[PDB]
């Protein structure tokens, strides 16, 4: 129906990514609610309840049953434009949609920039330490 890169914009796709999500009926953070809020399920060995906003790329773990996904998103990523979108997918215009997909592309890039930066700084600490140690000895 739609190209893969775009599917995350569809609630039903997002819900479908929740495979062995523990919080089901009786909980506030169900797949349906997590998906309404923008989240995708990206579990690891290490953190199996890991969820990520498809739009702003904020990751959250440590979900609890009474957690309202929307309020958790607002808290941890207050600037995410997906939270601003009021219309359903099919009510957006192509211009609106293209404007959203650009802001998402830019969010992805900011995330990868921010990671590269952190990795580089960790490597720079190690190298600096090694050289201090050598000058000290």
């Amino acid at each position: 129906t739609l190209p893969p890169a775009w599917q995350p914009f569809l609630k039903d796709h997002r819900i479908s990514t929740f495979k062995n999500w523990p919080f089901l009926e009786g909980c506030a953070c169900t797949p349906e609610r997590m998906a309404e809020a923008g989240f995708i399920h990206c579990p690891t060995e290490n953190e199996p309840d890991l969820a990520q906003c498809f739009f702003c790329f904020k990751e959250l773990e440590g979900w609890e049953p009474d957690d309202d996904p929307i309020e958790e998103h607002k808290k941890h990523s207050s600037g995410c434009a997906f939270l601003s979108v009021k219309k359903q997918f099919e009510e957006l215009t192509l211009g609106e949609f293209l404007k959203l997909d650009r802001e998402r592309a830019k969010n992805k890039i900011a995330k990868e920039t921010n990671n590269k930066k952190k990795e580089f700084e960790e490597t720079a600490k190690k190298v600096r330490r090694a050289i201090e140690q050598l000058a000290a000895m």
Binding site: L50, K58, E59, L60, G62
Partner: peptide, 4 residues
């Protein structure tokens, strides 16, 4: 929930 909480930030990684």
């Amino acid at each position: 929930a909480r930030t990684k």
